[PDB]
Symmetry: C3
């Protein structure tokens, strides 16, 4: 490998994607990424907080993008101010529990893992220190995604090349914040303090919150996603621990790889697709009409009561052939 | 469009389908449909009632059938005796939140929406007035389905034409009826009165009832579906808010589009398939043996305790080559 | 049929598979299997027990393997020491509610059912005596799987023959053990005694335990599965009543039939796949690296808190090209 080019990448925060090329402009390279683990309390909603544990300070962790056959060398840093051990498990990798058995670092330590991205697809990465710590760290926010694109870019079900203009990485996360008998949420001084109470909620399998980008409303209102009519947007969707059923209100999935692995034929014209807990899927959609759209988990209680809603504001000209109000509300 | 034929359809109640042709006998047409919103209390089971909000007086709303490339003009009526605003969101449509942003009507108003059915598949339609009203109206019963057939009819995974004799539209709906501490259900005078208590149940994500055709037992016993040996039945299955896993006890899915979009290859020989909450899927089965069958959501607690069971009684001759009792129960 | 060969099989306990050949070495045969129903209390975990009802004394029931077009003649025995009626419903069969309407046997009776295995795939079989007994017997442990292999063996998405070295049958089962207010589990003298309390837990749809091979830890530690680098292992996964999302930590699904029916194209390179409640799926993986792997349901709360974890210990040489620790934990 001393013989292959090295590319150092600067990660950007979700839902955005760092700069990259859809068709690799070179032969296999070694992609260098660095992340700092940040433990901090985050506001999930009005009066709801989580003692979170995060990759690079965001939930989800940032999206990494590489090409099939490249190597990935991740420098993971556990700063001394943190309270516990962490590691990383890449579903894109082969061996040593996804890298988790080679990356356990205590506060004050760093580690560098190299793996070959042998399989194309969007994949979850997540913390997995061992035993009960595995689910607890993930539902505390420690998960992201790496997208391994085919070297010749995405292809559809007949082998035709397809291209996107923008990638939006929707990281959906379920959380289990303990509640007082009246339904209000509990607050703690650090992650460990709230562990036993959080387990009791985890045992019910009912999340208190299910959110995109780490908080209710993160991608609504002022944080709405933007696009223009004609844009091909690839929505890469991860859910590290619980199923989701994404749907774009007013749109469709033109090409969808719900299990997220690019050499498999994508399905077309979907209304709603399915992201298995522990995976990332991807859906491409070409916007045809301007206006407000919402992208949701279509259990509408999870979308609206729990937080799994993002908005997309689209600029452009309206096409009355696709839809038209014939008789406006009247009476 | 002033230039295309217009077809006025009379909807029939689920689980049945209005008259139609599998292969369009004409070029694009404008299909005209009308529905009246009916708010009324319905009996979900012995001692369990729902203050329902329905399209055309049924749960699910009626099935609309058209062909890809046709237009759909829906006249939606909110009668003055109703208590709240409603609208319609067609997952089959493009733009304005599926039509929801163009169809909000208060009691005493009507609206007419036209959209082009550009994509083949079975799709959910549902009420979505905005915010918390979206899940609450849907789990109150406001959802149905439109099936957009390819103009040249259904095709299998090799492009072969396939045909059905009968369509049965199974609309599965999850409901969240509030309970007293002893497990008995609460009753209310109107939808609004029971809203806060219903939200508390919705927040648990555990339905009190999961039903086909709007009630426990609707399609069992006297309401059992009928068929004959040799019949090809297309079971179109919607679930607007929560996943389901349909299975025909004693049968199979010969051809199944679980994500419900007809240009995608169907899978064959399934035992159980999966309907994502917020979608409609379809399964074709040719009956080979007479007798009693049941069609269920195969979480058997949801099928039996919650209500997701229908029966099918099939007439015809038994084939001992497919199955035979060799030694009858004895001892 | 008096004219076809008969093969008597000796079933082996899950997760193993009885001896068989991938490509049938003969024309259609009549496969003879026998199972004894055993009602007994089983230890699901430290301080958690289930009054179980089992096929052949195991949970899941044993795997049967035959080829498409063969017949299956199952001798089912309900010994006189048992307390209730039981039967069997094969999702692989056509008619009479999968055989359930021809196999209801009381304690002290036997029955022999013949059916033709007309469709290739892994399929669930389970007890289904009628009404509320259907879910209760299944979540009490009465379910297994039959795998009907194509006569010419498994084929991939291009029709290429694929072969496995070992089949591991992972039977995942959800259970609903009643709890005291403090979270501890209740114990009963027999199945019937605990029925009403179990129903109350079933109604919540939240399993107390979700396990492989009938108990928490059954296939971890001393019961870890074994393999060598280079082995192609087919993981056949059943879940008779509730969804699962299998994932091999450190591995992938090379070829996966998640809906479990072999003539459908398998998907490749999956990280996590999905088993619908009421079905069996299959995933083939070639081990590339030695070490510890875990095979889990990837809702990590279900995997770790509820019991859905197995371990696989793999012997062989490590490949630093696939993964290497560049900088070991240091600081
Ligand atoms: Cu961690
Ligand atoms: Cu994982
Ligand atoms: Cu409404
Ligand atoms: Cu919708
Ligand atoms: Cu039984
Ligand atoms: Cu079944
Ligand atoms: Mg940085
Ligand atoms: Mg409080
Ligand atoms: Mg397109
Ligand atoms: Mg009418
Ligand atoms: Mg009462
Ligand atoms: Mg056929
Ligand atoms: Mg024996
Ligand atoms: Mg106790
Ligand atoms: Mg391979």
């Amino acid at each position: 490998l001393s013989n292959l080019p090295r590319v150092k990448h600067t990660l950007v925060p979700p839902p955005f994607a760092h700069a990259h090329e859809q068709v690799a402009a070179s032969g296999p390279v070694i992609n260098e990424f660095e992340m700092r683990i940040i433990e901090k309390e985050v506001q999930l909603d009005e009066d709801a907080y989580l003692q979170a544990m995060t990759f690079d300070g965001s939930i989800p962790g940032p999206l990494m993008i590489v090409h099939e056959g490249d190597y990935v060398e991740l420098t993971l840093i556990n700063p001394p101010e943190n309270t516990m051990p962490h590691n990383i498990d890449f579903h894109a990798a082969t061996g040593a529990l996804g890298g988790g058995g080679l990356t356990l670092i205590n506060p004050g330590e760093k580690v560098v893992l190299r793996f070959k991205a042998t399989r194309a697809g969007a994949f979850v990465y997540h913390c997995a220190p061992g035993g009960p710590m595995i689910p607890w760290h993930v539902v505390s926010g420690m998960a992201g995604c790496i997208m391994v694109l085919p070297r010749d870019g995405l292809k559809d079900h007949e082998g035709k090349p397809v291209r996107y203009d923008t990638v939006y990485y929707i990281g959906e996360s379920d959380h289990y914040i303990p509640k007082d008998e009246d339904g209000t949420y509990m607050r703690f001084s650090d992650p460990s303090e709230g562990y036993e109470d959080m387990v009791a909620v985890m045992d019910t399998l009912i999340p208190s919150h299910i959110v995109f980008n780490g908080a209710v409303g993160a991608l609504t209102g002022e944080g709405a996603l933007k696009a223009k009519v004609g844009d091909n947007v690839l929505f890469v969707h991860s859910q590290p621990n619980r199923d989701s059923r994404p749907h774009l209100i007013g749109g469709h999935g033109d090409l969808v790889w719900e299990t997220g692995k690019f050499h498999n034929a994508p399905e077309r014209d979907l209304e709603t697709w399915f992201i298995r807990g522990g995976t990332a899927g991807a859906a491409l959609y070409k916007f045809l009409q301007p206006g407000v759209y919402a992208y949701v988990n279509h259990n509408l209680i999870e979308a609206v009561h729990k937080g799994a809603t993002a908005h997309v504001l689209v600029e452009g000209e309206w096409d009355n052939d696709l839809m038209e109000q014939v008789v406006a509300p009247v009476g």
